């Protein structure tokens, strides 16, 4: 049930964890459920049984010049974040500073959209996406077309909290700028290079008159990067024309 | 091995029982095979042949634990030494019976094949006037059948009955034990908690599962024609195997055994009783002459295991077991050790009784026993609650404390500091107990202070006034003493200190990390495996305790604990350094790029993965791979002659060229010296 388990761990999972071999990575890893159930003393064991079921396949791999091996130390990875969770539930210290360091670590990490799901997937237990939004607008821009080109537009909308698909002729949300920001940018990207170069300019505008509340010693940061982003806009409306 | 090599050839000779069971701890322990195989079986095969059940039993574990070692001195052992007890199994002899019991089961490759051979041999061996081959070497045919289940008896059943009560007995019940795995699981589920007395009685557990009920009718009355007094276990071994109506046998069985159940076929009576179980009500009503035993280690095991195999019938079991030992622990220090040890692992419902044995312990001369009593009172006064047990559990365990700073003896010095356990807090946190504790943390021998401090950490938690500012002076002044004293041997033991003093007392530990770390690296970097484990152990905690606060400091540990690392093909214990490195960068979050700084450790990582064999360290391994992201091959590889003659020339030449030079390859090695 390798694959109903991995259907149940997107968007009977109960089931499904009990139809997989269990003499594998996979098993104990799919099994470390234990992490769904914050079954944390259940947990510490599976990820045992992870680390000595996974092994060999390390030592497997050492005559292909650990090519291949990046899949097991990509399973190496994600084990260590089974038991960040652990950690990061356990000790509310080790949360923000969990943050610091899982990003460092994704930085190093190849650009494989596939991988950066499967990080997401068990990062979902511990920090919402609307947290580290760094790593979701990454995501969707890891490629002109991520790993299809229809992620990026789900992943924006989860960020937005508005459809414009379904929305028709909304206009630009009161969101995070970089989200809207990286939403024109792909609607330039497609057939809709009009419609992207007349938002691009309203959320020219729109940042304009937004600068103008943001005048003050505690809030001036926003204000340099609004003129940050608008310089990047202006660039953009100007290669568009 | 000398000294033991030639004990095994004066204890095979000979008091035997003590030697042979003292040595079987250590045949199969230390690992030795150079003599353990080689010229040891030679004392075997000359010594065994007289010796009687217990003490040869062991010899025959000794015997299977020779063949286990698998090399050329043992092959050339199983071979020599079963063929000989094939034909041996020739009255001289008995041991020959064993050895084909254990011998043949070690390389079941052989003698999975001579399965008929055997018996054969048994048809001739079983003529011998003695009779003691009749009983054992034909029992001993489990040897040459239980092997085919691995990969006969349909007919061998009928031979056993037709051609071979001795004969057709012996044989009978192992070809039916060998028809399935379970024949012989029943035996291993059982072993969690004349021969042909006992043989007839083994008939019944499994005749019962081959055929069934004929045969169970007849069995019964050859067991009681053989005169009916007997170690009746066939019913309690049935009602574990089938449960084959094994109660209509009882009528006959239970008026015989019920005499032999008093301490007074004896050694075992009780196991004739529990097992059936699986008629409660009788088993309850007998319990009184079982009750009714001394304090034997044997026969309170043998009601303990009662007990577990029948939980409703515990309480009376515990309730005899419970005043049967407390009153020889309330009237002696040779025999108390077993009450006070089952009283207090026993699920029993014991105070004073402590503070009296301990009193009569503490003035015996018996090392043995103020070993054993030392710990085993601390066993009892787990219950403990009246004033009274409090102070009796402080007075004694303090006292014991007292013999763990006086006695000059370090095996009782262990036992009564091991003996403060965890489940004595609140109590050991009493001036009675911490006061002594002082003078042990301040004594002139290092061992005293060595074992204390674990007990003393544990208690800072507890009582500060007698713990904490005596913590806080040992880290500066065992630190201190580790290199301003010169001490030798000494310093492990004072290097064990640290981490003991640290574990277990945080609030010592954060603002002192600073003079503790920068003091603890330098011994790091001082020099001895005795020392760094414990220091390299130390730091990993101090590094989990202050988190990344200590990222300063990071490069230097990290730089010195990889180092170690490195050489752990020789300090085959800096599995330790796995460890350290670990939690130091997941406790600091170093940056994660140690492989390009210091790319070795991915290397080294590696290495041990496809070096070391045991699970713990490649499961740390892999814990520290893991630690860090998952690196891009890209990065990581941004941070790191027969044929090829052959085709540029003639034959002719080719020839002296790859000769010339394997011949030089040879010469500029070192390994030239022999050749």
Same mark, same amino acid.
């Given at each position: 049930?390798?694959?109903?388990?991995?259907?149940?761990?997107?968007?009977?999972?109960?089931?499904?964890?009990?139809?997989?071999?269990?003499?594998?990575?996979?098993?104990?890893?799919?099994?470390?459920?234990?992490?769904?159930?914050?079954?944390?003393?259940?947990?510490?064991?599976?990820?045992?049984?992870?680390?000595?079921?996974?092994?060999?396949?390390?030592?497997?791999?050492?005559?292909?010049?650990?090519?291949?091996?990046?899949?097991?130390?990509?399973?190496?990875?994600?084990?260590?974040?089974?038991?960040?969770?652990?950690?990061?539930?356990?000790?509310?210290?080790?949360?923000?500073?969990?943050?610091?360091?899982?990003?460092?670590?994704?930085?190093?990490?190849?650009?494989?959209?596939?991988?950066?799901?499967?990080?997401?997937?068990?990062?979902?237990?511990?920090?919402?996406?609307?947290?580290?939004?760094?790593?979701?607008?990454?995501?969707?821009?890891?490629?002109?077309?991520?790993?299809?080109?229809?992620?990026?537009?789900?992943?924006?909308?989860?960020?937005?909290?508005?459809?414009?698909?379904?929305?028709?002729?909304?206009?630009?949300?009161?969101?995070?700028?970089?989200?809207?920001?990286?939403?024109?940018?792909?609607?330039?990207?497609?057939?809709?290079?009009?419609?992207?170069?007349?938002?691009?300019?309203?959320?020219?505008?729109?940042?304009?008159?937004?600068?103008?509340?943001?005048?003050?010693?505690?809030?001036?940061?926003?204000?340099?990067?609004?003129?940050?982003?608008?310089?990047?806009?202006?660039?953009?409306?100007?290669?568009?024309? | 091995?000398?000294?033991?090599?030639?004990?095994?050839?004066?204890?095979?000779?000979?008091?035997?029982?003590?030697?042979?069971?003292?040595?079987?701890?250590?045949?199969?322990?230390?690992?030795?095979?150079?003599?353990?195989?080689?010229?040891?079986?030679?004392?075997?095969?000359?010594? /065994?042949?007289?010796?009687?059940?217990?003490?040869?039993?062991?010899?025959?574990?000794?015997?299977?634990?020779?063949?286990?070692?698998?090399?050329?001195?043992?092959?050339?052992?199983?071979?020599?030494?079963?063929?000989?007890?094939?034909?041996?199994?020739?009255?001289?002899?008995?041991?020959?019976?064993?050895?084909?019991?254990?011998?043949?089961?070690?390389?079941?490759?052989?003698?999975?094949?001579?399965?008929?051979?055997?018996?054969?041999?048994?048809?001739?061996?079983?003529?011998?006037?003695?009779?003691?081959?009749?009983?054992?070497?034909?029992?001993?045919?489990?040897?040459?059948?239980?092997?085919?289940?691995?990969?006969?008896?349909?007919?061998?059943?009928?031979?056993?009955?037709?051609?071979?009560?001795?004969?057709?007995?012996?044989? /009978?019940?192992?070809?039916?034990?060998?028809?399935?795995?379970?024949?012989?699981?029943?035996?291993?589920?059982?072993?969690?908690?004349?021969?042909?007395?006992?043989?007839?009685?083994?008939?019944?557990?499994?005749?019962?599962?081959?055929?069934?009920?004929?045969?169970?009718?007849?069995?019964?009355?050859?067991?009681?024609?053989?005169?009916?007094?007997?170690?009746?276990?066939?019913?309690?071994?049935?009602?574990?195997?089938?449960?084959?109506?094994?109660?209509?046998?009882?009528?006959?069985?239970?008026?015989?055994?019920?005499?032999?159940?008093?301490?007074?076929?004896?050694?075992?009576?009780?196991?004739?009783?529990?097992?059936?179980?699986?008629?409660?009500?009788?088993?309850?009503?007998?319990?009184?002459?079982?009750?009714?035993?001394?304090?034997?280690?044997?026969?309170?095991?043998?009601?303990?295991?009662?007990?577990?195999?029948?939980?409703?019938?515990?309480?009376?079991?515990?309730?005899?077991?419970?005043?049967?030992?407390?009153?020889?622990?309330?009237?002696?220090?040779?025999?108390?050790?077993?009450?006070?040890?089952?009283?207090?692992?026993?699920?029993?419902?014991?105070?004073?009784?402590?503070?009296?044995?301990?009193?009569?312990?503490?003035?015996?001369?018996?090392?043995?026993?103020?070993?054993?009593?030392?710990?085993?009172?601390?066993?009892?006064?787990?219950?403990?609650?009246?004033?009274?047990?409090?102070?009796?559990?402080?007075?004694?365990?303090?006292?014991?404390?007292?013999?763990?700073?006086?006695?000059?003896?370090?095996?009782?010095?262990?036992?009564?500091?091991?003996?403060?356990?965890?489940?004595?807090?609140?109590?050991?946190?009493?001036?009675?107990?911490?006061?002594?504790?002082?003078?042990?943390?301040?004594?002139?021998?290092?061992?005293?202070?060595?074992?204390?401090?674990?007990?003393?950490?544990?208690?800072?938690?507890?009582?500060?006034?007698?713990?904490?500012?005596?913590?806080?002076?040992?880290?500066?002044?065992?630190?201190?003493?580790?290199?301003?004293?010169?001490?030798?041997?000494?310093?492990?033991?004072?290097?064990?200190?640290?981490?003991?003093?640290?574990?277990?007392?945080?609030?010592?530990?954060?603002?002192?990390?600073?003079?503790?770390?920068?003091?603890?690296?330098?011994?790091?970097?001082?020099?001895?495996?005795?020392?760094?484990?414990?220091?390299?152990?130390?730091?990993?905690?101090?590094?989990?305790?202050?988190?990344?606060?200590?990222?300063?400091?990071?490069?230097?540990?990290?730089?010195?604990?990889?180092?170690?690392?490195?050489?752990?093909?020789?300090?085959?214990?800096?599995?330790?350094?796995?460890?350290?490195?670990?939690?130091?960068?997941?406790?600091?979050?170093?940056?994660?790029?140690?492989?390009?700084?210091?790319?070795?450790?991915?290397?080294?990582?590696?290495?041990?993965?496809?070096?070391?064999?045991?699970?713990?360290?490649?499961?740390?391994?892999?814990?520290?791979?893991?630690?860090?992201?998952?690196?891009?091959?890209?990065?990581?590889?941004?941070?790191?002659?027969?044929?090829?003659?052959?085709?540029?020339?003639?034959?002719?030449?080719?020839?002296?060229?790859?000769?010339?030079?394997?011949?030089?390859?040879?010469?500029?090695?070192?390994?030239?010296?022999?050749?």
């Amino acid at each position: 049930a390798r694959m109903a388990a991995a259907a149940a761990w997107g968007l009977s999972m109960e089931e499904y964890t009990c139809m997989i071999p269990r003499d594998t990575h996979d098993g104990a890893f799919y099994r470390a459920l234990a992490l769904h159930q914050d079954l944390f003393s259940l947990a510490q064991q599976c990820i045992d049984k992870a680390r000595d079921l996974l092994d060999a396949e390390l030592t497997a791999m050492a005559g292909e010049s650990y090519s291949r091996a990046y899949g097991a130390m990509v399973s190496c990875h994600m084990l260590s974040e089974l038991e960040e969770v652990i950690q990061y539930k356990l000790v509310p210290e080790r949360r923000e500073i969990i943050r610091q360091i899982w990003w460092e670590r994704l930085q190093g990490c190849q650009r494989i959209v596939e991988d950066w799901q499967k990080i997401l997937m068990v990062r979902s237990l511990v920090v919402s996406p609307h947290e580290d939004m760094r790593t979701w607008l990454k995501y969707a821009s890891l490629c002109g077309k991520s790993g299809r080109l229809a992620l990026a537009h789900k992943t924006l909308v989860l960020l937005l909290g508005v459809d414009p698909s379904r929305q028709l002729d909304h206009p630009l949300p009161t969101v995070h700028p970089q989200v809207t920001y990286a939403y024109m940018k792909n609607m330039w990207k497609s057939a809709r290079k009009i419609d992207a170069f007349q938002h691009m300019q309203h959320f020219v505008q729109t940042m304009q008159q937004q600068a103008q509340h943001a005048i003050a010693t505690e809030d001036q940061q926003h204000k340099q990067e609004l003129h940050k982003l608008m310089a990047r806009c202006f660039l953009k409306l100007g290669e568009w024309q | 091995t000398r000294f033991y090599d030639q004990l095994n050839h004066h204890i095979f000779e000979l008091e035997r029982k003590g030697g042979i069971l003292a040595i079987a701890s250590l045949i199969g322990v230390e690992g030795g095979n150079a003599t353990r195989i080689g010229r040891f079986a030679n004392y075997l095969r000359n010594l /065994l042949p007289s010796n009687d059940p217990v003490v040869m039993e062991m010899a025959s574990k000794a015997i299977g634990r020779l063949a286990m070692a698998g090399d050329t001195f043992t092959a050339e052992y199983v071979e020599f030494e079963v063929k000989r007890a094939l034909e041996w199994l020739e009255g001289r002899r008995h041991a020959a019976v064993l050895v084909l019991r254990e011998l043949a089961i070690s390389v079941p490759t052989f003698f999975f094949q001579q399965v008929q051979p055997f018996f054969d041999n048994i048809f001739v061996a079983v003529w011998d006037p003695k009779q003691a081959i009749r009983e054992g070497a034909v029992a001993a045919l489990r040897a040459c059948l239980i092997l085919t289940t691995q990969r006969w008896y349909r007919h061998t059943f009928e031979e056993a009955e037709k051609g071979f009560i001795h004969g057709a007995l012996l044989i /009978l019940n192992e070809l039916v034990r060998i028809s399935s795995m379970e024949g012989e699981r029943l035996r291993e589920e059982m072993e969690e908690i004349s021969l042909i007395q006992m043989t007839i009685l083994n008939l019944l557990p499994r005749l019962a599962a081959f055929r069934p009920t004929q045969y169970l009718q007849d069995t019964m009355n050859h067991v009681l024609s053989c005169e009916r007094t007997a170690a009746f276990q066939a019913l309690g071994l049935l009602s574990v195997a089938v449960r084959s109506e094994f109660k209509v046998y009882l009528p006959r069985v239970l008026d015989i055994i019920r005499a032999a159940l008093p301490p007074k076929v004896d050694a075992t009576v009780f196991t004739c009783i529990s097992m059936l179980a699986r008629i409660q009500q009788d088993i309850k009503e007998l319990l009184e002459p079982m009750l009714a035993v001394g304090l034997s280690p044997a026969l309170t095991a043998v009601l303990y295991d009662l007990s577990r195999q029948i939980p409703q019938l515990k309480k009376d079991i515990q309730d005899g077991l419970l005043k049967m030992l407390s009153l020889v622990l309330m009237h002696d220090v040779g025999s108390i050790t077993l009450a006070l040890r089952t009283l207090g692992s026993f699920e029993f419902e014991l105070t004073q009784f402590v503070r009296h044995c301990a009193d009569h312990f503490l003035n015996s001369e018996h090392k043995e026993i103020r070993m054993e009593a030392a710990r085993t009172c601390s066993r009892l006064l787990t219950p403990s609650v009246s004033q009274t047990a409090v102070q009796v559990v402080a007075d004694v365990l303090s006292k014991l404390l007292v013999v763990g700073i006086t006695d000059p003896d370090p095996d009782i010095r262990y036992c009564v500091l091991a003996s403060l356990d965890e489940r004595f807090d609140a109590h050991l946190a009493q001036a009675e107990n911490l006061q002594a504790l002082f003078v042990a943390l301040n004594d002139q021998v290092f061992e005293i202070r060595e074992l204390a401090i674990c007990t003393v950490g544990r208690l800072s938690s507890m009582n500060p006034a007698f713990v904490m500012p005596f913590l806080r002076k040992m880290l500066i002044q065992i630190l201190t003493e580790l290199e301003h004293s010169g001490i030798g041997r000494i310093k492990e033991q004072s290097a064990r200190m640290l981490g003991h003093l640290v574990s277990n007392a945080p609030r010592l530990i954060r603002p002192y990390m600073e003079p503790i770390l920068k003091a603890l690296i330098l011994k790091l970097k001082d020099p001895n495996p005795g020392v760094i484990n414990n220091v390299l152990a130390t730091i990993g905690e101090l590094a989990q305790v202050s988190g990344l606060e200590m990222r300063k400091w990071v490069d230097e540990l990290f730089i010195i604990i990889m180092d170690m690392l490195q050489d752990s093909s020789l300090l085959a214990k800096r599995q330790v350094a796995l460890w350290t490195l670990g939690q130091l960068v997941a406790s600091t979050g170093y940056v994660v790029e140690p492989y390009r700084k210091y790319p070795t450790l991915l290397e080294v990582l590696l290495n041990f993965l496809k070096t070391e064999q045991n699970q713990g360290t490649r499961r740390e391994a892999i814990r520290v791979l893991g630690l860090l992201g998952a690196l891009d091959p890209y990065k990581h590889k941004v941070n790191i002659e027969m044929l090829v003659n052959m085709g540029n020339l003639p034959l002719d030449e080719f020839y002296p060229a790859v000769s010339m030079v394997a011949l030089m390859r040879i010469f500029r090695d070192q390994s030239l010296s022999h050749h």
